[PDB]
Design an enzyme around this catalytic site. Structure first.
Site, PDB file in Angstrom:
ATOM      1  N   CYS A 275      -2.858  -2.004   7.425  1.00 59.95           N
ATOM      2  CA  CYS A 275      -4.153  -1.490   7.753  1.00 59.95           C
ATOM      3  C   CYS A 275      -4.609  -1.738   9.155  1.00 59.95           C
ATOM      4  O   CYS A 275      -5.322  -0.927   9.701  1.00 59.95           O
ATOM      5  CB  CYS A 275      -5.133  -1.986   6.731  1.00 59.95           C
ATOM      6  SG  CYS A 275      -4.443  -1.685   5.090  1.00 59.95           S
TER       7      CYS A 275
ATOM      8  N   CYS B 133      -4.674  -6.291   3.790  1.00 62.95           N
ATOM      9  CA  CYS B 133      -3.408  -5.616   4.085  1.00 62.95           C
ATOM     10  C   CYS B 133      -3.026  -5.569   5.520  1.00 62.95           C
ATOM     11  O   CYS B 133      -3.834  -5.246   6.363  1.00 62.95           O
ATOM     12  CB  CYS B 133      -3.403  -4.183   3.602  1.00 62.95           C
ATOM     13  SG  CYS B 133      -4.923  -3.327   4.009  1.00 62.95           S
TER      14      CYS B 133
END
Ligand code: MG
Ligand code: ZN
Lengths: 193, 109, 149, 116, 99, 225, 374, 180, 540
Positions: free
Chosen positions: D42, D39
């Protein structure tokens, strides 16, 4: 070829000449074969360019001499909402005894600095093209071809910004050679020796 | 110290001597720069952005008025305060009942 | 000093027709490269055509540059600097406003890929790598010729 | 390493370590951070978590778990989106706080100082 | 060296009886003129005629629509080049494996 | 009395930045250019100002050495004192001093001046103090024009000179517009003046006019032999 | 009513939220996030063009030209006011959003209850997940709207399901279409039976649905298509184009999507993500080709929000062009716009930070495709 | 640009370092100096009298300038030094163009003749106004530079004459008055 | 070479063909100096030491390393349909030749599968255009082919390689000024340059800063306190002052690798070797006929281009050494028997150290080291140079009232000659000037990666003009972007106040200050015929 091939020259190159040709084809100054200026028309306009600028400047001077200075310079003074006709000026002079120069100074006293810097294009020493002064943002953006495909926000950096080296685009911190070699056991300390 | 000496050269057509030209030019310059000295005779949410950045949407308004103000490029409260009632009237489909309701809503807080 | 001549980005003008010449050149290059794979032509011919279909195209551009300037924008600052003999040369001007064209290393060794972009449009990475060859050749032959003379 | 200092301070724990830390007793708040290497959002959360761990050197326990090795445990925790933080109080009577999204560091400080 | 180009858009009309078939160095089909010929460019308003007698390589066919600034013929630089023949060996490399 | 001038705009962006705009509408054809260029050359390089010329510290080995308790070095303190804006009307040399003690930040409010010189900004940063140490600095003020080069170093020992700049006006600009009178050609003149707070743009305009008149006066005196 | 038709983006407001979370085979280092950018160059199949909250969709719709209104609920904290401000600054009508001084935005209270297993229960819900229909739904916005956009995140909460149903009922009563972009959250990837019985009520009340390829396979059959994409011919190449050994862009036949069609459905989109956009109408099918050139900027190379731009472009072209329902060429020429928007939206770190404008997307469409395409 | 063809701008420190002998001789000759040490101390004191005597000495004393690379035959020329303030030698643009001027700082060696014969040879033979034709074929080596050529071209270029100055054909319908 | 933080990082990246067991200068053939197709991404094609040793001294590329066999390798990206599909492989120069390496974008669609499209590729040291199915590797890094010096040049695609080499050489000869400022338009590599320079204090531990002082910084982490010294007016190897300033307040948290203190020629963690000045390109009274600059007097009294220089060697004390704070002059002695300051050297004696013990294995008080500080203000004769190869020698300083002024009323700082632009073939300087002006009006800084035309044709034009128009519309300055001639504006004369008849280029570029301020003669003298002058010269 049967299939239309791809190329980096398929799209026409944006130029100032095309924008000016469209702007003067609007309002009926010149007539162009079709709705879009072609390359020969742009090449011809590149040679005959100052004539139309002089014509527009002469038109602006005639309008200034016809409508009066107050009604002319009221375009850049939007905080002054009053009758600007010559009859109104004469009536005001007959009523309150204020000449035209006094009314002009009074109307300029209600002007912002931005409006003054926009008005500074009507200087007698450097008269800007009246077509470019009143061009919309939709026409000016066509000079370079619109917004870029790659976002400009990726290039913008805050001036008073301290670079954070613990970021996704920076390598790991380089440890001290002595400590790095002492941790791995390559160099023994003085006491341990 | 750095002193400078000026050397003026004048060529007249004979109508006036070069010495009188200096005096005439100096008096004309003084007469041009005097006007700058002439004097006429005398005879919750209470912060900065908590109200300034309040866009019109948060302040409840009828739909008609909201849509109209938007087409008029009026988004925040400062744009509404800067615009007067006369130009507000100029806005299309804007009515006197609206002007009283927007004044009330701006005063109902 | 009174005139204050200056050179700008938009002041650099390219011959009206460049998008046509480059487009037909690359179209012919594609047709050739297709046929090569079918067996209609041989590599030597491909090599030759590529160099030529490019050299001719470039020269049309260079020769045409001067008429455009004199006929359309007579008082163009780059044209004033070039024609007066003050600074620049036709070859230098061509690289700025036209195309740099094909260039090779010393004693042959053609790059086989043309430079279709000038300095104003911006050279590609491959075109810049290719121009580095000529740059190195120049900066070494300068010293060689000085030491010999 | 004692001569050189560790660059990263947030340690990775398994699904059993979390259960062992919850069933026991503690005197400092616990922060669980679900993340996955894939991701994008993140990457921006790791820096904030490291700064928050530097601010609280021993007054808080910041650990992170991965959703590619503890997917079932992440699903059991009713985790819906990838950047999800759990703020668990030291008193075993106060409820936890699930926070989904890229919240600022000031919100984390406020939660730790008031809710926990 | 010198490349004859089209003056304007139109049709190229020439008599193919005086020109003899050939193959260009670049591999394209072509016509070689050993005598003077006069080609006509049937444009919208006017016509145009140009050609070189000793060596002309005509790269275009009869009744062919061409645009401006297109290479039509090659003078072929009939004047002889300096005779410094250098023979070079280029190698063809196989792109895929096989027999 | 047909020529009329009035201050169109007057703003105060900061305590050390003023802006004023003016107008001279009934002006004639060729007078506007001359007035504009002369007023510009008079506002930039003919008005005079008062600035700190010499600074004397208590006990320092050299101007590049540091001092305990203060973050900035002596060089940065001199550079900060260089930017202090003062106001005066009498030529000569005056003395001032700063004598702040204790932790805090020394500012312009801490400079004590003779009854002739005053301060404008009153909030400028000179240096920062972290320990309860007496800070005692000597100052020297002088009114002049242009910028001064710290070439002389005599008549005093233990004092570091600073290159002051006696330029009150920051920038200036003028614009000329047509009046539209038909046969007779009349022009409108505008003037923009940015001052550093020592004097308002109107006072700078009046002073530049007086300086131009003083420069043009001597041509009307009796010819010397 | 203004000329551009207004659209409603119903859902929750979250800064950066990736709902589709599955298991990835390849993994990177634990701590070094400086090398996590490598997995955004070759992403897993399910995160090639991730979606997000409807706020990003509204922002992209306004930036691409158009009018969008966000219908949700946020708290009176700093985060909720910040998000509202962000939206307002980008011209997203926020008349609908409501403020409640009872719950904190993003915070959800849960009880651990470690009893023979980690089983948590929700005691208090966030205001983004708790919106009532008694006095919060703004009738006016609903009246002036033509496309109602909502995700499957609202179906994972028992408090916004009835609100979503009431909103859909009112929107269809006033004469507005319903857009359904799944973006299946983590709990919805457990089994296809539960996810199909949980997203069945909203599926039958949707006129335009934009599914994903992985989502479509998970709904129909996963192992079947996983085996089909690995057929491995051994003797010859039958299709005469399988000898090149390229990727498998399988165009699903209209008979395979039959168990998902209904009477009220108007369009469907498979949305492989900036590469292929399979559109299915009750009268014709097709597919559009994409580029996926994210490797041109390796240092930014962020595809956090890519499906939002595609959905925004599709909604813009649908609200502007009414002929996209009964024409196939117009549909492709308009979906190329959404493809270009999704391609541009992958060259900037952050979804709201790198949403393109209409001029940039049109320039990319004109520079990538040939003139005969647009 | 203000310098003539024969004059050159000589810095103050270089000028005093070159004419130290002459200025010491001038100090000891007339007055204000009794020994070499007093004269050296007065010269080091930077008094106005030593600068006045330096100017009086260098008023008509020729000086030779030679570039470090002597590629061309005109690389060594003679000039008349003028006392200028700065750390750079000021030369004429035409001579600079004729001496192969570079973008980088080109070092210039300054030599001062002593004997009468050297001075006569430098004043009568090595001046720039006596060597303007290159010995190769006879072409002028001192030609206007880039800026001068641009100015002359802008002067003698004129302006547009046909369709670029008039829009419509003048066949349907005065210039400046006849300047005597 | 400790002149500036750039020479510290570009000195270790050098490769030398000459040396023990290597080719000499004249012995080396001409084939060794030219560029080879194998040097791509491994050796910089631009950086080359001018002189007799041309082509023998080269710089190592950015993405390059030794490959366990004394071979330098470069990264490449696999674009083949494999199990992983993405793996940055380091390829030896011999193994990379067998793969298809293409540097081109995938933004092309011509009614096909997108894999039948052509792309320029490199195979067997030859360039050819192939389909997208045949490519194996792919180069994706922008700075992969250039070194540190060539990368710090913004808009390098619009300049020639010769001027790139000239700029890479001139950037090494930069002087760290007193106050540093970041460039408005940059390339984005100054951050890592300042990181790897070594003049920036980086934190070796995490914790709060409990005590900030000019001499040292105290960092408190997990109980342990770490003391970090600070360089305060030290001397380099080439007479350059080194100083470090603090950039973190007291009581804030820090991590390992973040900046605690600044350095010389660095501000905010980025290389700062110059200042931003307003520049116009026009001829001015022949003062810039050649390569020359006519600067304004504002740069002298505003401390813009002021620098410090430290040299080592009544005021004499009892022992004979000059005391601290003494202002020595040319001719003054401090300790033939007593060392005297040479001509041109005058400044404050900052510190004196007595080298009683040499360390040369003996205590040798041969002499006592003394240090003088000279603050050299920008004067006539100094050389100022830009990042695009433009070089100029200052010819005259003019007051603020005599310089040309814009329509806003601000006087320009420097005036450059326009005729050099077509001579040296530099176009990127105009882009830099326009974008710097736009950023100064918009209060923004730009960091652009090289070769931005891969995204779209004429990308730099759009990037510059959009920012110019935004600065012209947000701030009401229509003279910034004029439609009739974008990038050019009309200016006035300072003496007469009259407009010039042609517009000029206006911008704020990043100008740097440079540190550097026989038989043929006998043959020439014999050609002239001056025998007595030749005899006098030979006898002297
Ligand atoms: Mg040189
Ligand atoms: Zn570029």
């Amino acid at each position: 070829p049967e299939k239309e091939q791809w190329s980096r020259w398929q799209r026409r190159r944006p130029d100032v000449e095309t924008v000016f040709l469209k702007a003067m084809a609007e309002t009926g100054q010149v007539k162009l074969y079709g709705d879009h200026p072609t390359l020969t028309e742009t090449a011809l306009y590149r040679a005959r360019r100052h004539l139309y600028k002089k014509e527009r400047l002469q038109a602006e001077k005639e309008k200034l001499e016809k409508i009066g200075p107050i009604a002319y310079y009221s375009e850049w003074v939007q905080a002054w909402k009053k009758d600007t006709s010559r009859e109104a000026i004469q009536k005001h002079f007959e009523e309150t005894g204020e000449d035209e120069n006094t009314q002009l100074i009074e109307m300029f006293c209600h002007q912002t600095d931005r409006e003054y810097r926009i008005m500074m294009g009507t200087d007698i020493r450097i008269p800007r093209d009246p077509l470019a002064m009143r061009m919309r943002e939709d026409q000016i953006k066509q000079i370079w071809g619109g917004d870029p495909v790659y976002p400009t926000i990726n290039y913008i950096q805050d001036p008073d910004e301290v670079i954070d080296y613990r970021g996704p685009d920076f390598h790991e911190p380089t440890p001290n050679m002595l400590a790095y070699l002492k941790e791995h056991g390559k160099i023994i300390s003085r006491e341990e020796l | 110290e750095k002193q400078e000496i000026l050397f003026l050269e004048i060529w007249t057509n004979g109508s006036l001597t070069p010495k009188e030209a200096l005096h005439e030019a100096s008096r004309n310059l003084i007469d041009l720069f005097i006007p700058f000295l002439h004097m006429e005779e005398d005879n919750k949410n209470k912060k900065k952005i908590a109200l300034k950045s309040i866009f019109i949407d948060q302040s409840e308004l009828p739909s008609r008025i909201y849509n109209c103000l938007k087409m008029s490029n009026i988004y925040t409260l400062l744009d509404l305060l800067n615009n007067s009632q006369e130009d507000l009237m100029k806005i299309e489909h804007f009515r006197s009942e609206d002007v009283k309701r927007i004044l009330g809503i701006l005063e109902k807080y | 000093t009174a005139t204050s001549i200056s050179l700008g980005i938009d002041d650099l003008l390219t011959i009206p027709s460049k998008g046509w010449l480059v487009q037909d050149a690359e179209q012919q290059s594609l047709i050739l490269e297709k046929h090569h794979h079918y067996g209609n032509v041989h590599a030597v011919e491909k090599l030759r055509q590529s160099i030529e279909i490019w050299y001719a195209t470039s020269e049309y551009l260079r020769q045409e540059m001067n008429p455009n300037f004199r006929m359309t924008d007579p008082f163009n600052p780059v044209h004033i600097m070039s024609f007066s003999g003050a600074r620049g040369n036709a070859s230098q001007v061509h690289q700025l406003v036209g195309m740099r064209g094909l260039m090779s290393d010393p004693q042959g060794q053609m790059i086989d890929l043309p430079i279709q972009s000038n300095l104003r449009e911006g050279l590609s990475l491959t075109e810049y790598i290719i121009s580095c060859y000529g740059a190195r050749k120049g900066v070494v032959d300068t010293a060689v010729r000085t030491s010999d003379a | 390493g004692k001569y050189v200092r560790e660059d990263y301070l947030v340690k990775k724990v398994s699904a059993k370590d979390i259960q062992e830390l919850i069933k026991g007793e503690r005197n400092v708040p616990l922060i669980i951070d679900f993340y996955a290497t894939w991701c994008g959002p993140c990457i921006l959360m790791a820096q904030e978590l490291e700064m928050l761990a530097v601010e609280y050197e021993s007054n808080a326990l910041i650990v992170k778990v991965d959703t590619d090795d503890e997917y079932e445990f992440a699903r059991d925790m009713q985790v819906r989106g990838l950047p999800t933080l759990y703020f668990i109080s030291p008193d075993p009577n106060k409820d936890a706080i699930r926070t989904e999204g890229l919240i600022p560091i000031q919100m984390m400080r406020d939660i730790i100082n008031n809710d926990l | 060296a010198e490349h004859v180009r089209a003056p304007s858009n139109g049709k190229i009309k020439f008599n193919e009886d005086l020109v003899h078939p050939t193959r260009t160095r670049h591999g394209h089909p072509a016509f070689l003129c050993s005598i003077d010929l006069y080609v006509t460019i049937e444009s919208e308003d006017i016509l145009h005629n140009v050609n070189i007698p000793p060596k002309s390589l005509l790269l275009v066919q009869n009744d062919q629509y061409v645009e401006s600034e297109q290479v039509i013929a090659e003078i072929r630089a009939g004047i002889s080049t300096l005779n410094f023949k250098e023979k070079v060996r280029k190698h063809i490399y196989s792109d895929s494996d096989g027999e | 009395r047909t020529l009329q001038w009035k201050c169109v705009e007057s703003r105060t962006d900061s305590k050390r930045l003023y802006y004023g705009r003016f107008i001279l509408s009934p002006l004639m054809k060729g007078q506007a250019d001359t007035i504009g260029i002369a007023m510009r050359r008079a506002l930039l390089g003919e008005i005079e100002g008062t600035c700190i010329t010499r600074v004397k510290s208590e006990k320092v080995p050299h101007e590049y050495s540091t001092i305990t308790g203060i973050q900035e070095s002596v060089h940065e303190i001199l550079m900060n004192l260089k930017e202090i804006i003062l106001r005066s009307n009498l030529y000569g040399t005056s003395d001032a001093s700063i004598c702040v003690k204790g932790p805090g930040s020394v500012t312009a409010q801490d400079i004590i001046l003779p009854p002739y010189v005053e301060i404008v900004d009153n909030t400028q940063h000179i240096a920062s103090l972290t320990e309860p140490i007496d800070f005692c600095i000597g100052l020297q003020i002088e009114r002049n024009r242009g910028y001064l080069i710290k070439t002389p170093h005599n008549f005093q020992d233990g004092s570091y000179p600073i290159d002051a700049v006696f330029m009150p006006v920051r920038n200036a600009n003028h614009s000329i517009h047509s009046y539209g009178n038909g046969n007779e050609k009349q022009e409108i003149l505008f003037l923009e003046i940015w001052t550093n707070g020592s004097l308002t743009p109107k006072e700078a305009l009046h002073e530049a006019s007086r300086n131009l008149i003083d420069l043009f006066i001597p041509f009307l005196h009796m010819e010397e032999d | 009513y203004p000329n551009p038709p207004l659209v409603i983006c119903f859902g929750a407001a979250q800064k950066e939220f990736v709902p589709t979370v599955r298991v990835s085979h390849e993994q990177m280092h634990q701590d070094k996030y400086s090398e996590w950018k490598m997995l955004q160059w070759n992403p897993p199949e399910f995160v090639r063009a991730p979606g997000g909250p409807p706020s990003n969709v509204a922002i992209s719709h306004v930036r691409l030209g158009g009018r969008a209104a966000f219908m949700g609920k946020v708290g009176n904290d700093e985060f909720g006011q910040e998000m509202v401000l962000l939206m307002n600054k980008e011209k997203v009508q926020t008349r609908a959003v409501k403020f409640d001084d009872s719950m904190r935005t993003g915070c959800t209270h849960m009880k651990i209850k470690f009893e023979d297993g980690k089983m948590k229960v929700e005691k208090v819900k966030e205001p983004a997940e708790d919106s009532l229909s008694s006095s919060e739904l703004n009738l006016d916005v609903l009246k002036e709207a033509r496309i109602f956009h909502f995700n499957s995140e609202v179906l994972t909460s028992s408090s916004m399901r009835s609100t979503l149903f009431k909103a859909i009922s009112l929107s269809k009563k006033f004469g507005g279409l319903v857009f359904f972009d799944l973006n299946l959250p983590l709990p919805l990837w457990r089994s296809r039976d539960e996810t199909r019985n949980l997203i069945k009520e909203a599926w039958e009340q949707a006129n335009i649905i934009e599914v994903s390829r992985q989502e479509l396979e998970f709904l129909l059959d996963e192992e079947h298509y996983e085996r089909k994409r690995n057929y491995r011919p051994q003797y010859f190449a039958e299709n005469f184009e399988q000898t090149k050994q390229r990727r498998d862009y399988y165009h699903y036949t209209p008979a395979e999507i039959a168990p998902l069609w209904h009477d009220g459905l108007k369009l469907l989109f498979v949305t492989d993500g900036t590469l292929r956009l399979h559109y299915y109408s009750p009268s014709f099918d097709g597919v559009v080709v994409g580029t996926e050139d994210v490797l041109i900027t390796p240092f930014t190379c962020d595809r956090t929000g890519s499906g939002d731009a595609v959905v925004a472009g599709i909604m813009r072209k649908l609200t502007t062009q009414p002929e996209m329902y009964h024409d196939q060429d117009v549909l492709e020429r308009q979906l190329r716009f959404a493809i270009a928007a999704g391609i541009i939206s992958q060259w900037t770190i952050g979804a709201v930070r790198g949403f393109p404008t209409e001029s940039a997307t049109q320039n990319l469409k004109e520079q990538v495709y040939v003139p005969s395409m647009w | 640009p203000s310098l003539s063809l024969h004059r050159c701008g000589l810095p103050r420190e270089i000028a005093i370092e070159l004419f130290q002998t002459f200025v010491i001789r001038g100090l000891i000759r007339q007055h204000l100096a009794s020994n070499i040490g007093v004269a050296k101390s007065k010269i080091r004191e930077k008094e106005p009298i030593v600068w006045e005597i330096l100017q009086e000495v260098m008023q008509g004393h020729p000086v030779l300038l030679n570039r470090a690379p002597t590629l061309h035959r005109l690389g060594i020329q003679a000039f008349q030094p003028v006392l200028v303030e700065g750390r750079a030698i000021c030369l004429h643009p035409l001579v600079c163009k004729g001496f192969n001027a570079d973008f980088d700082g080109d070092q210039m060696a300054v030599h001062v003749p002593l004997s009468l014969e050297a001075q006569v040879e430098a004043r009568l033979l090595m001046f720039s106004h006596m060597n303007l034709l290159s010995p190769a074929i006879g072409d002028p080596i001192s030609v206007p530079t880039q800026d001068m050529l641009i100015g002359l071209y802008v002067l003698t270029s004129g302006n547009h004459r046909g369709i670029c100055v008039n829009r419509y054909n003048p066949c349907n319908r005065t210039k400046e008055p006849f300047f005597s | 070479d400790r002149t500036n933080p750039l020479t510290q990082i570009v000195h270790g990246r050098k490769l030398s063909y000459l040396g023990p067991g290597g080719l000499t200068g004249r012995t080396a053939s001409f084939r060794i100096r030219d560029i080879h197709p194998s040097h791509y991404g491994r050796i910089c094609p631009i950086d080359t030491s001018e002189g007799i040793n041309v082509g023998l001294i080269g710089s190592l590329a950015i993405h390059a390393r030794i490959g366990h066999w004394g071979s330098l390798e470069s990264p490449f990206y696999e674009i083949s349909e494999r199990s992983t599909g993405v793996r940055m492989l380091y390829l030896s120069p011999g193994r990379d030749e067998y793969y298809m390496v293409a540097a081109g974008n995938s933004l092309a669609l011509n009614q096909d599968i997108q894999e039948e499209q052509v792309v320029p590729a490199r195979y067997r040291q030859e360039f050819l255009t192939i389909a997208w199915e045949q490519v194996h590797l792919r180069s994706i890094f922008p700075f992969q082919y250039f070194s540190i010096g060539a990368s710090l040049i913004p808009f390098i695609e619009h300049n020639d390689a010769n001027r790139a080499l000239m700029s890479s050489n001139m950037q090494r000869q930069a002087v760290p000024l007193s106050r540093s400022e970041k460039c408005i338009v940059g390339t984005g590599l100054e951050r890592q340059a300042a990181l790897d320079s070594g003049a920036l204090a980086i934190a070796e531990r995490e914790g709060r800063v409990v005590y900030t002082n000019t001499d040292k910084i105290l960092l408190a982490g997990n109980g342990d306190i770490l003391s970090i010294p600070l360089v305060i007016y030290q001397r380099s190897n080439k007479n350059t002052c080194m100083h470090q300033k603090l950039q973190v307040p007291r009581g804030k948290c820090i991590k390992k690798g973040q900046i605690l203190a600044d350095g010389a020629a660095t501000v905010g963690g980025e290389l700062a070797l110059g200042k931003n000045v307003l520049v116009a390109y026009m001829p001015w009274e022949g003062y810039n006929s050649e390569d020359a600059v006519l600067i304004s007097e504002r740069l002298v009294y505003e401390d813009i281009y002021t620098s410090f220089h430290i040299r080592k060697y009544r005021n004499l004390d009892k022992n004979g050494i000059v005391m601290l704070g003494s202002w020595v002059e040319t001719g003054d002695i401090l300790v033939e028997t007593c060392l005297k300051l040479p001509i041109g050297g005058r400044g404050r004696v900052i510190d004196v150290r007595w080298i009683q013990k040499r360390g040369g294995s003996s205590y040798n008080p041969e002499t006592i080291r003394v240090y003088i500080l000279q603050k050299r203000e920008i004067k006539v004769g100094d050389k100022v140079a830009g990042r695009h190869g433009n070089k100029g020698i200052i010819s005259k300083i003019l007051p603020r009232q005599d310089m040309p002024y814009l329509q806003d009323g601000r006087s320009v700082d420097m005036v450059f000659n326009p005729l050099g632009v077509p001579s040296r073939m530099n176009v990127g300087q105009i882009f830099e000037c326009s974008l710097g002006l736009a950023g100064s009006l918009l209060d923004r800084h730009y960091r652009i990666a090289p070769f931005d035309e891969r995204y779209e044709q004429e990308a730099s034009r759009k990037l510059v003009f959009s920012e110019l128009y935004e600065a012209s519309k947000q701030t009401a300055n229509p003279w910034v972007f004029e439609p009739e001639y974008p990038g050019k504006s009309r200016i006035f004369d300072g003496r007469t106040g009259n407009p010039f008849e042609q517009p000029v280029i206006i911008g704020k570029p990043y100008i740097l200050k440079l540190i550097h301020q026989g038989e043929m003669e006998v043959w020439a003298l014999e050609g002239f015929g001056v025998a007595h002058i030749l005899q006098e010269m030979l006898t002297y």
